[PDB]
Structure formats: structure tokens, C-alpha cells
Amino acid sequence: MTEYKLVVVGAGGVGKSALTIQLIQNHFVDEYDPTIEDSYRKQVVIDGETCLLDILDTAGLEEYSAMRDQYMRTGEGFLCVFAINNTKSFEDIHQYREQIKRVKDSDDVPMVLVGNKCDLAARTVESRQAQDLARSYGIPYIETSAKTRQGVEDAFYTLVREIRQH
Amino acid sequence: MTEYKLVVVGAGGVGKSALTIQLIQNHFVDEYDPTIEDSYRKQVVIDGETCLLDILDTAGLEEYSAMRDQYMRTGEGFLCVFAINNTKSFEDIHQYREQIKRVKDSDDVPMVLVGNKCDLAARTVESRQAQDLARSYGIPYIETSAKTRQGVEDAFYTLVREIRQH
């Protein structure tokens, strides 16, 4: 069956893993649990096609360097996550975008900018900032909350259709 | 506030109106009620931006001709709906696509192919057929059910982000 090799990328503490686990296990993880590397496979039906989603949940900070080079070359599409109440996480998005471009030899790699934690009133990144960024990269911008499940299948299905249309 | 002028297009009986009403009024219309022309405005928040959705729900069959020319030139983006248990409705999609192209003077107009009634086991249009069609047009393909609300905000938000990225 069709498999789509997805990787969730972004700064430490932005909700990469809580996003991933709301999709696969249907619940919010409210605690401190930093990732090294975690892999999830789930058979799912998207727009009538049977497929398997093979998600690689990555570390934010780490000694991950060209140890990131390795998962970035096998990933077919990328969720690039930041948190809307953390301005620094938003500036680091550029970092992840160029390093993805570098290793894939491509300027057009399947990608969606995800602004997570939208349930929180304490926003420091305006939607318009991120909308314009995502438009400069030729990329979709979707806001999510791993807390309320607002936008999580959206962000992930949108990325599977980007890989389709590539 | 930003307004997005959306129009729902497609053959008679495909679920144009039940799709529209599940979005705006949160319920399934199980009856016979053909449309002439209906308009819906709703203030909504998509990906943190405040916007108003101005949806034009159109007639499928009619004496609608260049009386369709008029709403097709003011529409910013189009949902092109067919039903997955009606092969003829799927072949007519081409009709609506060329006439949209003609009046907008454009080959790149915001559009998403929607395959509705996916809750029904009695499919005559395979997902792969429609996936390939939608890929030949450079367009997203999303399946919906106005009955279960499966995919309806998806199909509509996807089209608002196409207008954004245009």
C-alpha cells in the first residue's frame, strides 16, 4: 500500500510529540517528556486511498546535527512546527527549512508550517507574520492545538496531499 | 476583514447544498430541495485570521448558462463537487472546469475537487480515478460526506488556503 514518510521537525517544547500522539493515540500528553527519536506507523484511509503513515518524531535541541541529515533525506514531507507563544521557535523555523533544502537538493520539498498551541491566550507570533512567511516559502500555514485536537488531522492530511501533488 | 468569495459548483443532486449547510448550520438535510441560488455569509476564524466566508450555492441542472458566467467571474475559488456513487456527475466535472477557465481568463484558478457521499457503500467512481484527474488539473482532491460531516471543513478550508497561496 502506499506509504508516506513524514517527519515532524522544530524547536524543543513546541508540541511535536503531543501533535503526533493526538493523531495516533487520541489524547493529550500534558507532561515533560523530551524526545530522542520516535517512530509511528498507522494504517489510515485518506480521501478513499488506503495508506500507511510512517511518522518520525524528532528531537528539538540535541546533539542532532547531520544526525538530522539522515532522517531529512529519507523523509518525503515535513511538518515544521513552532509555538505561537514562543517567538524564538518561529525564528528557528528558517534553520530547519534551509537544512531540509540542502540535503534534499531541492527548493520544492513537500512541507507545511504548523503554528501550534493556538488554544493559549498569550500569543507573541501574529497569524499574519506566519502567513506571509509560509507564502514566501511556497508552503501552506495551518494553526493547531494538540490540546483541543484543533487542526491536527488537517495539518497531517494537508502534508500527505502535498506529497501527492509533488 | 478579509472576505473570500467561494462558489460550490456541480451536477444536480451531488450534495452541494447539504455540504454548505453542514458547514454553516451544523446539520444534515436528508430531503429533496433543489436550488436556484442561495447565498451564505459567516464570520469564521481560519488559521488565526478573522475572515468572512461568502458562499454562493448554485443550481446543478437549470436554465443556468451564461447566467453561470456571472457568478463564475466574481468567485475567487471553487468547490467542484460530484458524488462517488454517480459516474455521470464525475464526467460532468470537466464541463464546469472549462467554463470556469473560459470566464476567468485563467488556467490557474483556486479550485478543489470534492468527491461527496463517501459514507455510501455503492461507489462507482474509484478514488484513484479522481486522484489522477485532480492531479492533471493542478488541484487538491478531497472526499466528503455531508451526512457524517467527514471532510466538510477540510474541503472548505483547503479552498480558502488555495486563494491565499494564489
Ligand SMILES: Nc1nc2c(ncn2[C@@H]2O[C@H](COP(=O)(O)OP(=O)(O)NP(=O)(O)O)[C@@H](O)[C@H]2O)c(=O)[nH]1
Ligand atoms: N496548551 C498547549 N500545550 C501544548 C500543546 N502541544 C504541546 N503542549 C505542551 O507543551 C509541552 C511540550 O510538548 P511536547 O509535545 O513534549 O513538545 P516537543 O516539541 O515534542 N519537545 P521535544 O523537542 O523536546 O521533543 C508539554 O507540556 C505539552 O503538554 C498545545 O497544543 N497546547
Ligand SMILES: Nc1nc2c(ncn2[C@@H]2O[C@H](COP(=O)(O)OP(=O)(O)NP(=O)(O)O)[C@@H](O)[C@H]2O)c(=O)[nH]1
Ligand atoms: N448519504 C449521503 N447523502 C447525501 C450527501 N450529500 C447529500 N446527500 C443527499 O443527496 C440529496 C441531494 O442533496 P442536495 O444537497 O440537495 O444536492 P444538490 O447538489 O445541492 N442538488 P441541486 O443541484 O438540485 O441543487 C439529498 O437527499 C441529500 O440528503 C452525503 O454526503 N451523503
Ligand SMILES: [Mg+2]
Ligand atoms: Mg518530543
Ligand SMILES: [Mg+2]
Ligand atoms: Mg442545492
